[PDB]
Symmetry: C2
Subunit: 385 residues, 2 copies
């Protein structure tokens, strides 16, 4: 029955831990962006939020503020129409991306005509590991994310100098894109309650629009940062930042889009959520890229733009030794090192970044790929329309 | 691209709060049930665990044991191949049903040729509320304008709306126990259950060190109108007692989906299709009357009336939820929950959705009838509907 297309995509700016956005309840953050993508969309023709049929939102730590189907709770918090169905999903770091895969699915099945995929992570309000806790006081364990980043690094001959060159360029490329206002179209600025040094609301609610994570960065400077692991090569200036943010993409059946005055903007050429190798934990992008290129019938050379998530520099460097891409087409507006990584959101964020960059530069094809806790990886290939 | 169809479906028996399955890590319970639905398909064909491309699982209380994407942890726990992708989902009480819906889309999209929708809840091990903290209304924001009651309160509001007495729900709760013992004593669940190896526990809840095969639903109990009438309402002034509402349970279910082309290519009979699917919103004041809307939505998507449907599975969260739904849609009640519902069989929340689809399928097949409706109320004022057809 259906053919899914993106008709609109938007994101909050990404705030730092305890930064510009720590004053929003996670449900508000998400809800705000849910309404923002519907509002952006509603301009060309009369689309209203009750035209939406289902919402599917990635979120990793589904505890407290982020428990109880946040995709549903945000929708309602934001005062949007209660008839609209909502599901929240978890496949760690890829949840945000997976949400788009799933919404596409539903349209393809002719189950819905209009859906919103989104993702959220208010890592200031609800932090990593808040969803377990008691846990104690053949058959072996996944490394933790910092151990994996070093394992991946040893596997590929990736050196401290290598990853510092990377983190520096991530910072540079983001600063340039900010300077040029390349983010301006994708960003819905957000009203946030301002907290103080004591963590209490002043009265003010600033209008946040800039990604908080940018920072003057130097080869010399990076240079003296401490590894996070004893004996490791990853520092803080070469691994993504903990952040707050939310993102949202609005999908339609192309014919319904076309019939009610909305312009289709992109389709999915191919999509995947694949397993990775437990030992390396986060090398998943090798696997997901391989699978979507394979399905698409394409080679890395056919892809104009790649968003691969800078969880850690080694991950990306490791994925580049395997698929041998042109580094000038990978993370062109910088990435998570510079801009931040609010885990549940990132996957919808990346799709959002890439679509706008294909639109800005008038190019055709983008690859989106992320590694993910529990040794998963998500990949997508989108084609501009 | 794809035309998605169920080739196999299986479920654990359902175990009581602290009961026959409480000895198992939530992950082990799903893990076993995931492994089992694959196993069943391999008996007819070459198909094995690594042919599955993705698993999607439902689970509501996504804390501790049930956290960090239990769908994946479970798969890995059962020793199944690591190359398979996995995601866990939450649309509350419908999660297990939506998981099915979602696998079907990924097939329809041509994303995958083979997938598993499953569901788990080990309420023995992880209980309602364990995913929020102490002050249970710091999960909203201090701008919550909507009147959304707790589930018990909701069942009583629906009850008042429809004029449902303490007699009616006690009449209802008895008939579920009666149908569930009749289905069981007839071995109606035999094809659908795959028996689960479980540790035995002592009068405390300590493992004796003996394994056992569990094969029956623990919740069947002797019930009489008298006995039902002596039970104390969950809420003061309420009509619902422990006898006319579902039981906190452990269980899991899983359904194996394939493209139709790939199915016949690999030797397997398609068993059923989705005719229509929905997840929709409910009136928040009533909270749990959603089945009324989802039944309406899927009935329309399909082009049918209630009267076209051979059997219904509507979840018995509360007697009044079902009676409210019947009083609005006017079904033939002998065709509703024909083998008993969650009052008698139990309600392992995240699993029930796949459980209802597995049960529903199996009754069509056992009766050579055509159409089934599965509908469920869910927390957050939601409701999943599915119309499946034997194919
Ligand atoms: Cl009945
Ligand atoms: Na649905």
């Amino acid at each position: 029955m259906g053919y899914p297309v993106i008709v609109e995509a938007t994101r909050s700016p990404i705030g730092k831990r305890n930064g510009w956005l720590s004053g929003l309840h996670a449900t508000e953050l998400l809800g705000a962006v849910q309404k923002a993508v519907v509002d952006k969309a509603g301009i060309q023709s009369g689309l209203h939020a009750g035209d939406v049929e289902q919402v599917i939102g990635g979120c990793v730590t589904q505890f407290g503020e982020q428990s109880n189907n946040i995709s549903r709770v945000a929708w309602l918090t934001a005062g949007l129409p209660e008839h609209v169905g909502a599901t929240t999903v978890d496949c760690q770091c890829g949840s945000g991306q997976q949400a788009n895969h799933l919404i596409a699915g539903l349209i393809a099945a002719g189950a819905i005509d209009v859906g919103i995929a989104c993702g959220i992570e208010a890592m200031s309000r609800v932090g990593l590991g808040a969803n377990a806790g008691p846990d104690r006081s053949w058959d072996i364990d996944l490394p933790n994310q910092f151990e994996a980043a070093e394992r991946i690094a040893k596997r590929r001959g990736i050196t401290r100098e290598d990853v510092d060159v990377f983190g520096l360029e991530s910072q540079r490329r983001a600063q340039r894109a900010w300077a040029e206002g390349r983010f301006d179209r994708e960003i819905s600025p957000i009203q946030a309650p301002v907290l103080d040094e004591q963590n209490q609301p002043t009265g003010e609610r600033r209008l946040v629009f800039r990604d908080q994570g940018l920072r003057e960065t130097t080869m010399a400077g990076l240079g003296e940062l401490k590894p996070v692991l004893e004996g490791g090569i990853h520092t803080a200036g070469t691994s993504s930042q903990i952040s707050d943010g939310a993102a949202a993409v609005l999908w339609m059946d192309e014919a319904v889009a076309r019939a009610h005055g909305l312009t289709p903007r992109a389709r999915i050429v191919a999509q995947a959520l694949v397993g990775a190798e437990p030992y390396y934990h986060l090398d998943g992008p090798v696997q997901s890229t391989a699978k979507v290129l394979e399905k698409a019938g394409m080679k890395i050379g056919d892809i104009d733009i790649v968003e691969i998530n800078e969880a850690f520099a080694s991950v990306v460097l490791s994925w580049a030794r395997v698929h041998e891409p042109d580094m000038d087409r990978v993370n062109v507006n910088g990435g998570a090192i510079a801009l931040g990584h609010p885990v549940g959101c990132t996957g919808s964020r990346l799709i959002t970044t890439a679509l706008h960059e294909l639109e800005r530069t008038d190019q055709s094809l983008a690859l989106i790929t992320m590694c993910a806790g529990g040794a998963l990886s998500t990949g997508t290939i989108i084609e501009r329309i």
